[PDB]
From a paper:
Third, we demonstrate efficiency gains in ligand-soaking experiments for structure-based drug design (SBDD) approaches by solving the structure of the anticancer target tubulin in complex with both small molecules (some of which are approved chemotherapeutics) and with new photochemical affinity switches for the optical control of tubulin function. Notably, 27 ligand-binding sites have been identified in tubulin so far56 making the protein an excellent target for SBDD. To demonstrate how this could be exploited for SBDD, tubulin crystals incubated with single ligands were loaded into individual reservoirs. These reservoirs (loaded simultaneously into the multi-reservoir extruder) were sequentially measured without disrupting the low-pressure helium environment of the Prime chamber and without entering the beamline experimental hutch. For this part, we determined 7 crystal structures: apo structures for both TD1 and [name]-[name], [name]-[name] complexed with four ligands known to bind to different tubulin sides, and TD1 complexed with the photochemical affinity switch SBTubA4.
Author numbering:
A (entry chain D): 1 to 42, 45 to 360, 369 to 441
B (entry chain C): 1 to 440
C (entry chain B): 1 to 42, 45 to 360, 369 to 438
D (entry chain A): 1 to 439
The structure:
């Protein structure tokens, strides 16, 4: 088969990772015990991508759970699908990371990384034909952002021709008031820009704004933010998990979505997102879905596609619908927003349709955009970094682990360059 | 004698191969288990259908074909489908990792791991032949395997078989059913690489086929299944001259002499008529004159271009079914006085006609109405250059910025190979211009 | 001057050759098995010119069948009188010649040619006093054109003092298989000019025009064209096959018909030719045969003889008729068109009469003219050749078999010299 | 007995020879068997007929003749025919392939290969001659064999039998009969090469014989058989003086003496009368004066020409049958007063007369009626030069374009021979003009 190895690191990584496994296990008909009980054969056609087949018709997530503190591990293990994960794939420490990137990347994490690599190797050696890895993590803390980007480097050295895919949750002060998050993020983007092949930018600021302004939720909980994350992760992996033509593996997706090696940061979006009161009086239609997944407020990255240009776009529709109508709607939206798509990449919007809808919806749509407007995300993190680095706040926290000051300067200059590149291709014309 | 080995590369080549061999079986009366009740020669023969099927001692009629793909899911359908008993398992070759829509991976990284095995199987087929005539190669332009592996294969076949003739059936990319934004790159690379190794290539424009299915067949959103059944009708018409015999049948190689005035100008334009749904065929009976006029309607071409804006260098008409020469002649006389048919000044203005008496066949569950007579026109017109121009333009738009190029460089290619291929395309367009200019 | 060895090569050569053997076998009372069943000893007096005697009063055509693909000779074995040919005289390859002169003459043909020469040599060895050879072929394809002219060259090397005579079918867009026919024909004419003593030019354009305009056949097939060819071949060979007031052979014919060595291309013609069906029973008369035999529209190589002059003319009348009336009619035809006959060759029109008419007819007439108007035929091919050659279109089919452009340039120059030679005597 | 040997060359020579020997046997009463009941001398003798026939101890009378053809189908007819028993195999020489109407092929190519065999067979007949006087040679002008091989033969006969006389009976080509296009070439080439080797040549124009057969025999379309039976009557008239007792033209030298004053001008005109259809039941018998007048009618001549516009060098009247000298003298007296008969000044104006009492014999079943008296006039007149003018003109027409010349050069002849022969003919026409005209 064409197997993927999943890795989740840190608190955020293990929370969104666990929900991901819960949602796709439901979609593929796997019960918490690992037994199959679905009906449609499409559920098992590509089950091998994410699941090993053990004895007794059990399906085991090809997943590796990693953290620097025994917490979470237990919550995960004592959760809906905790008994489905392979006991040996839990690798945890004790010292914790204290939201310190250096503690994750250079010291305590380094102390644990070899134990993780043995499990990675053990899972990979049994893959009929491994295609790559996916990591879920946050960029704001210590374990996920620090030890996660370390795991990425170590795996990239032993499997240099495999795809490295991350779901990276971006820090926002509206959800986490931990002050050194801007620093951790900048150190992480510096790693991601150079060692991953494709990165879904899951923005906590955008998830917060969707809950507050669109779903009209007074106090958004992590459960709300994670339900949005899980719906998007279900969508963006639909083409990997069900029989299909377009973007059917990580490499074809990357070849279609990444026109230049550094510009591999994707802006996801989901539809439908409807306030509780309006759902009853809002029709669920193909024109509704197409219009809404191109809306700036529906992006899961806090940015305005109207402020930039789309390099590439992948759209995925799920459920029973008319292919003719989808074709007509997708062309309509490109025609009415042509100036927002770079003219030097012809036929840059690709569309897939999968017959199996997600849980609880007659139909849905998932948007994956490689737009230059994502520079806004990197500018926001850059602003918060320069207002905390001019006065050297907390620097000691990192120098106390051995880090020189220039590593902060390089991780910042590299991010300013990334912004300049997005702008360079944002202004390039064809004539 | 005069055997032809078919080679199906990649998803498009394989799925089109499936359509073709099902149709061949129906045309010859061969059952899905290989039995051909009507063949009293057991264990072999020199019948016209033997140019495409070998025979076992147990009476099985086996396609002279190799299916090749770098991943298994597509060929697995052949391995488990209706005609799974028709092919020997050795004819179905699959890898484990595809070319990821990347010519570089098809020609180099992945292709090199399987090319020798494929050549070994082709050799086993060739050794069963008493007079191998050549190869027919089915592939897409856009896929990583259809472009890269096909190029690699053609080069190796030129080494192992010399100038033994190699014909292509090539799927030209169209946005409506496109799977990669880099299809223009793969298209130009494979066309440059195979240009010297191919004697004749029949391009099938997926957009043209899509449009014909929508218009003439009343299919809302045509799938690959729709397209492939139509494409197979065109392929069947082109190979019928090799598989059937009759007093007025003309071999494809005789047409080939007329179709290729210079080695590089070897891309004929195919037109097919009639394409009509059962609903619409229940009323009209299309005459010889009607289907022949249809051949000069641009909307019935297999490649979008305008023959009125070009010059003809050859026109061949391949009729099958209830057609007698008297009626063909009268039809042609009409077309010569109602259509704008300009020939180059260095070539005789004459239509070359072949007639096969075996009626067209339709697959059960198909969309084509069963008709009594059909015609496939093959012309060599300079208007087909329009197809190269559109492709070259998409290539230039991306290549000016080097978009997606790193995927190819990372797999060992160099930018020099890109500009080489593009200059060869520029020369091909200029060639199509020169042959059209009047003499001195 | 007795035995003639017959060779038929390629598709056209073998189809017309097969009809030639059917027709004359019927005339000589030979059945498809080779047993005689006729009523006259006129049938057997010169049967040895074309037939050998086996055991059991069996007559076997002195004929050699050559091709580079087996199809056509299977049709010959399966067709009428297929059983009459010597099985060992079927010489064929498997590859074909793809309508390519170069393939027939230089590559595929070179591999088969020695086998053919073994059969030719074996047949010649059995001849009491061999007269020469006749070859049937087309000039527009590959085997008859290329390998036929290769065979002619080899035979002239082994039998330099025998007559080489061909019935050569000229290509025409009206009945065409491929566009490269003008290439194949120009290359062949150059060989014929050099290596044959007499060549009957059977023009597919004229055969087509006769079937269309005169016989009113809308869709002429090769069968129709070949029935015309068979009738002309029977008529031109009458003098060789039956006893009469003429003890002629190929050499006396050549000495009388060819005043200059290169001008040896004859314009044949046949009469009567009549469409259905009323006139089909009407008694035809000698004045009508004589006037019809000289009419330009009745010529099997159309080059309006009124645009040229007759160097020599042979006329053969068949059936029981008045020889006095034949003389009067030929004389008056000459008197009525004596501007069309060169004055510097006195008495250049010769008439022969044979008592046995062809099957199906009470009387007939066959024309053989050495006219300068044949130049129009070579001029037509020359134009088709140059239109393509000036752009080197389709040359790659030939260059890939070893040939180079110089050989094409040579052939074209040689044929234009032939045209201007014919032109020179048209004004003298 | 001085013996005479006949050589028949080519188709025309052989077929005319057949007709002549048939007629000789009828005239002398020799059976096809070869037996001659009237001959009481068995196995030999000195009779006049022994000049043409030898004898065996078994009483077979063998023609002193040789037949040569370069292809076999014509001599085969002699072998399997009525008088097959007359000849023996050594006398009939056949080849495999003919001269193809090509003088060069008969003279150079094929003649070289067979000439010695032919002379050997001639030496065998000559060895049985107690006093051979010479040769009579029969051939066409137009055939390849009749022209090319004959001239080669005449050259060799002049070498091997230098003293002996050589007479020709020659068939001049005529379109109305059966001519090939190049017969004028062969005619001039052979006349040139033979001119100095022949002492007296009797030309028979096929055109004249054709018209005599149509006009007087009512034969619609004369065949070779009709023509040759009339020619053989003429030939028989000429040689009868050699085959019967008599005193005029009794040996071959006498032909030259009586008819040829200048060696080059050695082509006597033959005129014969009467030619009466064997179908006419009631015919009135012509007198001596009437057949003698007919001798001066152009219609009765062996060559169409007008003796009135010429000069006579010699005249010989040869009568057969019921003729007395008194009636001949009366006839000559009248003709000299009613005809334009002018002789050259350096000859006598006179007539040599011969009378053979035995009447002409007619082949049973032939076209000619038995008559009681016939006459053959042999006159050396310059009017026969018309025949040369016609021939030379046709030659000039083709030779000016070199038409057909390559056929001759291909057999090893040089183009120059053509010109040499044409100048010799121009000289011959000039000789005739000097003897005959008086500006
Ligand atoms: C828009 C939705 C449904 C719908 C049905 S018909 C229509 C116009 N919309 C669903 C889509 C589901 O993918 C899930 C995302 C919702 C995340 C929840 C945690 C959310 O925060 C929840 C508290 C809500 O806001 C609703 C309960 C109102 C939610 O079901 C509606 C919604 O937006 O999600
Ligand atoms: C002499 C003929 C006919 C004729 C005219 S008047 C008479 C008593 N007979 C023959 C001619 C023969 O040389 C043969 C060639 C004929 C070709 C046919 C096969 C032809 O294709 C056929 C279909 C015809 O058109 C005719 C049957 C009318 C044919 O006889 C024409 C012709 O001249 O026949
Ligand atoms: N007509 C037709 N086109 C097809 C079919 N399958 C794919 N294509 C077209 O072919 C192109 C993609 O090539 P594929 O054959 O899918 O690729 P491949 O050869 O498998 O190459 P890789 O997957 O990259 O290894 C696109 O333009 C498709 O629209 C088919 O069954 N019919
Ligand atoms: N009078 C007469 N003329 C003849 C006869 N045979 C042939 N001719 C004439 O002779 C000329 C042809 O010469 P042939 O005697 O046939 O030729 P040949 O000597 O056999 O020479 P080839 O056959 O060429 O080798 C023509 O002018 C004929 O008309 C004949 O039997 N009688
Ligand atoms: C065996 O075949 C033939 C052979 C010949 C001739 C001929 O045409 C009549 C043939 O029959 C067709 C022939 C031809 C043409 C002549 O003049 C151009 C000539 O002078 C003379 C002839 C022939 N001779 C005669 C007297 O007809 C000899 C050669
Ligand atoms: N969307 C989302 N964000 C989270 C979740 N848990 C933590 N975060 C974010 O994660 C960042 C800190 O990551 P954390 O998991 O505590 O760091 P680590 O475990 O030391 O690597 C903060 O910006 C939080 O907003 C979660 O369940 N969902
Ligand atoms: N008249 C006539 N022409 C033919 C026949 N067959 C082929 N041809 C002509 O011959 C040419 C093609 O030559 P062909 O004999 O088929 O080629 P080959 O087999 O390579 O020698 C074309 O101009 C045809 O029109 C036939 O049976 N009769
Ligand atoms: Ca069989
Ligand atoms: Ca071979
Ligand atoms: Ca040998
Ligand atoms: Ca005696
Ligand atoms: Mg936390
Ligand atoms: Mg594939
Ligand atoms: Mg052919
Ligand atoms: Mg002869």
């Amino acid at each position: 088969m064409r197997e993927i190895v999943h890795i989740q690191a840190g608190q955020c990584g293990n929370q969104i990772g666990a929900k991901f496994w819960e949602v796709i296990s439901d979609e593929h008909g796997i019960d918490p015990t690992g037994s199959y009980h679905g009906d449609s054969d499409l559920q098992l056609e590509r089950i091998n991508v994410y699941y090993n087949e053990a004895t007794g018709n059990k399906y085991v997530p090809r997943a590796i759970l990693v953290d620097l503190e025994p917490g979470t591990m237990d919550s995960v293990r004592s959760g809906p699908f905790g008994q489905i994960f392979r006991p040996d794939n839990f690798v945890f420490g004790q010292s914790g990371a204290g939201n310190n990137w250096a503690k994750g990347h250079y010291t305590e994490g380094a102390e644990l990384v070899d134990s993780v690599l043995d499990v990675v190797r053990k899972e990979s050696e049994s893959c009929d034909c491994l295609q790559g890895f996916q990591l879920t993590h946050s960029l704001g803390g210590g374990t996920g952002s620090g030890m996660g980007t370390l795991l990425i480097s170590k795996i990239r050295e032993e499997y240099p021709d495999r795809i490295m895919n991350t779901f990276s949750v971006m820090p926002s002060p509206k959800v986490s008031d931990t002050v050194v998050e801007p620093y951790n993020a900048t150190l992480s983007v510096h790693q991601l820009v150079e060692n991953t092949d494709e990165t879904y930018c899951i923005d906590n600021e955008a998830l917060y704004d969707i809950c507050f302004r669109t779903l009209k939720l007074t106090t958004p909980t992590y459960g709300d933010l994670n339900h949005l994350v899980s719906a998007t992760m279900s969508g963006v992996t639909t083409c990997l998990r069900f029989p299909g033509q377009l973007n059917a593996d990580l490499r074809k997706l990357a070849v279609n979505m990444v026109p230049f090696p550094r510009l591999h940061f994707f802006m996801p979006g989901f539809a439908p997102l409807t306030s509780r009161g309006s759902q009853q009086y809002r029709a669920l239609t193909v024109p509704e879905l197409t219009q809404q997944m191109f809306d700036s407020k529906n992006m899961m990255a806090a940015c305005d596609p109207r402020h930039g240009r789309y390099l590439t776009v992948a759209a995925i529709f799920r459920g029973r619908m008319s292919m003719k109508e989808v074709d007509e709607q997708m062309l309509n939206v490109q025609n009415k927003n042509s100036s927002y798509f770079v003219e030097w990449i012809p036929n840059n919007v690709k569309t897939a349709v999968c017959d199996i809808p997600p849980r609880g919806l007659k139909m849905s749509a998932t948007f994956i955009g490689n737009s230059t407007a994502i520079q806004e995300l990197f500018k926001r993190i850059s602003e918060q970094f320069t207002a905390m680095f001019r006065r050297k706040a907390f620097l000691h926290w990192y120098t106390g682990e051995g880090m020189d000051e220039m590593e902060f300067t390089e991780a910042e200059s590299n991010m300013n360059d990334l912004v300049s590149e997005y702008q360079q291709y944002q202004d390039a014309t064809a004539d | 004698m005069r055997e032809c080995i078919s080679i199906h590369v990649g998803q498009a080549g394989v799925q089109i191969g499936n359509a073709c061999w099902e149709l061949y079986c129906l045309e010859h009366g061969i059952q899905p288990d290989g039995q051909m009740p009507s063949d009293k020669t057991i264990g072999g023969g020199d019948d016209s259908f033997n140019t495409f099927f070998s025979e076992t001692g147990a009476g099985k009629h086996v396609p002279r074909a190799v299916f090749v793909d770098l991943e298994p899911t597509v060929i697995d359908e052949v391995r488990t489908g209706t005609y799974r008993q028709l092919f020997h398992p050795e004819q179905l070759i699959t890898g484990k990792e595809d070319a990821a829509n990347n010519y570089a991976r098809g020609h180099y990284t992945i292709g090199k791991e399987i090319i020798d095995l494929v050549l070994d199987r082709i050799r086993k087929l060739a050794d069963q032949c008493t007079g191998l005539q050549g190869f027919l190669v089915f592939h897409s332009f856009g896929g990583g395997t259809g472009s890269g592996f096909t190029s690699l294969l053609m080069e190796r076949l030129s080494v192992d078989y010399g100038k033994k003739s190699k014909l292509e059936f090539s799927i030209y990319p169209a946005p409506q059913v496109s799977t990669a934004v880099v299809e223009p790159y793969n298209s130009i690379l494979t066309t440059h690489t195979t240009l010297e190794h191919s004697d004749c290539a029949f391009m099938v424009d997926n957009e043209a086929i899509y449009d014909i299915c929508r218009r003439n067949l009343d299919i809302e959103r045509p799938t690959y299944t729709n397209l492939n059944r139509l494409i197979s009708q065109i392929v069947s018409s082109i190979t019928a001259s090799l598989r059937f015999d009759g007093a007025l049948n003309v071999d494809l190689t005789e047409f080939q002499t007329n179709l290729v005035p210079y080695p590089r100008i070897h891309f004929p334009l195919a037109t097919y008529a009639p394409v009509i749904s059962a609903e619409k065929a229940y009323h009209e009976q299309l005459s010889v004159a009607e289907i022949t006029n249809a051949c000069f309607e641009p909307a019935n071409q297999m490649v979008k271009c305008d023959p009125r804006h070009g010059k003809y260098m050859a026109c061949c008409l391949l009729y099958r079914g209830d057609v007698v020469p008297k009626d063909v002649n009268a039809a042609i006389a009409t077309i010569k006085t109602k259509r704008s048919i300009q020939f180059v000044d260095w070539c005789p203005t004459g239509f070359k006609v072949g007639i096969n008496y075996q009626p067209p066949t339709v697959v059960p569950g198909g969309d084509l109405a069963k008709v009594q007579r059909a015609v496939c026109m093959l012309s060599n017109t300079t208007a087909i250059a329009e197809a190269w121009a559109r492709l070259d333009h998409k290539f230039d738009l991306m290549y000016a910025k080097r978009a997606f190029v790193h995927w190819y460089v990372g797999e060992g290619m160099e930018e020099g190979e890109f500009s080489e291929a593009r200059e060869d395309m520029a020369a091909l367009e200029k060639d199509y211009e020169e042959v059209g200019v009047d003499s001195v």
